[PDB]
């Protein structure tokens, strides 16, 4: 099955699950859940969120 990738987190979005948000410039974002959508809409960078894959990769932790 072809899954997509979250834009805030890196989690795989399986069909029928996520939500889309397309910005003023017209470039699309996919969010796995209402939580990630909430953080991305408050414009929190995933790099400073300790549990995110971005943070894990940034601190060479994976």
């Amino acid at each position: 099955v072809k899954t997509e990738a979250c834009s805030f987190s890196e989690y795989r979005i399986y069909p029928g699950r996520g939500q889309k948000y397309i910005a003023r410039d017209g470039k699309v974002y996919f969010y796995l859940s209402s939580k990630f959508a909430s953080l991305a809409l408050q414009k929190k960078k995933a790099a400073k969120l300790r549990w995110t894959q971005t943070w894990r990769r940034n601190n060479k932790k994976t």
């Binding site: 099955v1 795989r12 399986y14 069909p15 029928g16 699950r17 796995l32 859940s33 209402s34 939580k35």
Partner: protein, 380 residues
């Protein structure tokens, strides 16, 4: 004088009285009309509501704005462990309705079946169906011949097997499934052959078949007229509260009409909903009941973490398109359509590409626990 502005009435008068149902089990008001040409067959089944998931399927509607895209559909899982056929009832037509000639039983009935006859089975000594099961085959065949001679409607008493389900309830659910099909003799023989064996869902129904569901809706106790009939809230300035109907009738007749919405019981109603399509009949034996030809992943229907408030579906099941009345664990009767449907939707062959089994608790991101552990790697 007349209403200034017309608007249709609140709610349907065809579902009155909105009182609690007599029983928890859905009850067929009427079976599909018998066609003498078709070979004898069962017309109904009973399962238990496990939960809901969603599936991905490829549309084949020419001229539809979807057509060749893959769409997501909500589906209800009904755990359908095989029943046991235990008895036969014959009905004859009289000007006063259908009259039972007699009901004959099988030679052996399960304790699960006998439990339904007891309020306190544990402290009884379970004497039910103990000395009437030793009737001679001579009188059994006599009663069967009389049924064949005089009866015009044949029904098979069959009961579910709640032990195969995660239900706490142990006493089986019993009903009679009308045998529609050939002649009276053929019906008699058809049910006599399987007078004691299991009746799986596969024999009763097929995939891609439109059926009807009979079940009791989810209960809500007494509800106000606003939530029970959809009446409009009164403005905020209303002196004695706003969640009510303002005028409950004209001066005359000097009575309240039965058509006026009032507070009362909401939910726990008996509903018969038509045209739920069977998307898949999943088998207990196979290990890929939730797999598709575009998934090839070895997985079963139960979502990762169990079905919330229900358990694990370890038996046969069917995937119904759409929603079904009742709570989880509710007994749900499935009935063949009153007349066979020939519409494009009824005749379509659903070909699903993906069946979701992520956790229905929270927002699950994985289809399998193996996938979750593979993603996370080792932990503490």
């Amino acid at each position: 004088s007349h209403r200034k502005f017309e608007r249709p009435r609140h709610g349907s008068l065809g579902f009155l009285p909105r009182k609690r149902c007599k029983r928890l089990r859905g009850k067929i008001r009427s079976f599909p009309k018998d066609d003498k040409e078709k070979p004898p067959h069962f017309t109904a089944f009973m399962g238990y509501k496990a939960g809901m998931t969603h599936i991905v399927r490829e549309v084949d509607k020419p001229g539809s704005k979807l057509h060749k895209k893959e769409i997501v559909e909500a589906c209800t899982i009904i755990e359908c462990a095989p029943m046991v056929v235990v008895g036969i009832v014959g009905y004859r037509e009289t000007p006063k309705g259908l009259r039972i000639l007699s009901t004959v039983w099988a030679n052996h009935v399960s304790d699960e079946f006998r439990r339904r006859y007891y309020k306190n089975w544990y402290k009884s000594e379970k004497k039910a169906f103990t000395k009437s099961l030793n009737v001679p085959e001579a009188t059994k065949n006599c009663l069967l011949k009389r049924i064949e001679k005089y009866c015009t409607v044949l029904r098979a008493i069959c009961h579910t097997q709640p032990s195969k389900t995660p239900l706490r309830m142990k006493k089986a659910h019993i009903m009679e499934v009308q045998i529609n099909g050939g002649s009276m003799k053929e019906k008699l023989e058809f049910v006599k052959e399987m007078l004691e064996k299991n009746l799986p869902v596969s024999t009763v129904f097929n995939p891609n078949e439109m059926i009807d569901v009979i079940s009791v809706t989810k209960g809500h106790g007494t509800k106000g007229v606003v939530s029970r009939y959809g009446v409009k809230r009164l403005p905020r300035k209303t002196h004695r509260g706003l969640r009510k109907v303002a005028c409950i009738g004209a001066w005359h007749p000097a009575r309240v009409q039965f058509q006026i919405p009032r507070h009362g019981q909401k939910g726990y109603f008996h509903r018969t909903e038509r045209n739920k399509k069977i998307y898949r009949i999943g088998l207990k034996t196979d290990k890929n009941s939730a797999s598709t030809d575009a998934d090839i992943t070895e997985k079963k229907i139960t979502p990762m973490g169990g079905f919330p408030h229900y358990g694990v579906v370890n038996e046969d099941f069917l995937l119904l398109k759409g929603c079904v009345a009742g709570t989880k664990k509710r007994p749900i009767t499935l009935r063949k359509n009153i007349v066979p449907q020939v519409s494009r939707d009824a005749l379509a062959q659903v070909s699903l590409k993906f069946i979701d089994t992520s956790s229905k608790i929270g927002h699950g991101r994985f289809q399998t626990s193996e996938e979750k552990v593979k993603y996370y790697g080792p932990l503490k």
